[PDB]
Amino acid sequence: PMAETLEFNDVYQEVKGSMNDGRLRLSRQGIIFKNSKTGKVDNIQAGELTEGIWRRVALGHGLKLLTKNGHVYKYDGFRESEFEKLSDFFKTHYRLELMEK
Numbered sequence: 001p002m003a004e005t006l007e008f009n010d011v012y013q014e015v016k017g018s019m020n021d022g023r024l025r026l027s028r029q030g031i032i033f034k035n036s037k038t039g040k041v042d043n044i045q046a047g048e049l050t051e052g053i054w055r056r057v058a059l060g061h062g063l064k065l066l067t068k069n070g071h072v073y074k075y076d077g078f079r080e081s082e083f084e085k086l087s088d089f090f091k092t093h094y095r096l097e098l099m100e101k
Contacts (some may be wrong), residue, residue: 011077027095046094055101
């Protein structure tokens with residue numbers, strides 16, 4: 001079932017063991033994460049993405065993304081059941097296929 005946006009208000013950015021809680025939002029154009037505590041926003045354009053990985057992490061499952069400029073983004077705390085919709089979104093809108101690891 002196709003969706004143009006996906007929202008996750010209960011996930012974290014993982015940075016060196018730190019779990020930064022925030023809001024993740026996927027649109028056709030890309031990805032925005034906003035750190036709840038610090039308010040720090042990170043934008044990722046669909047075009048920038050070269051790699052998407054889905055794997056078990058410390059809490060549930062997580063995405064690990066790579067962009068053309070070498071930046072790494074890790075968003076953790078997904079229930080495993082989210083794979084289908086995430087995989088679907090990436091393949092449909094981002095023209096990239098999540099690697100299951």
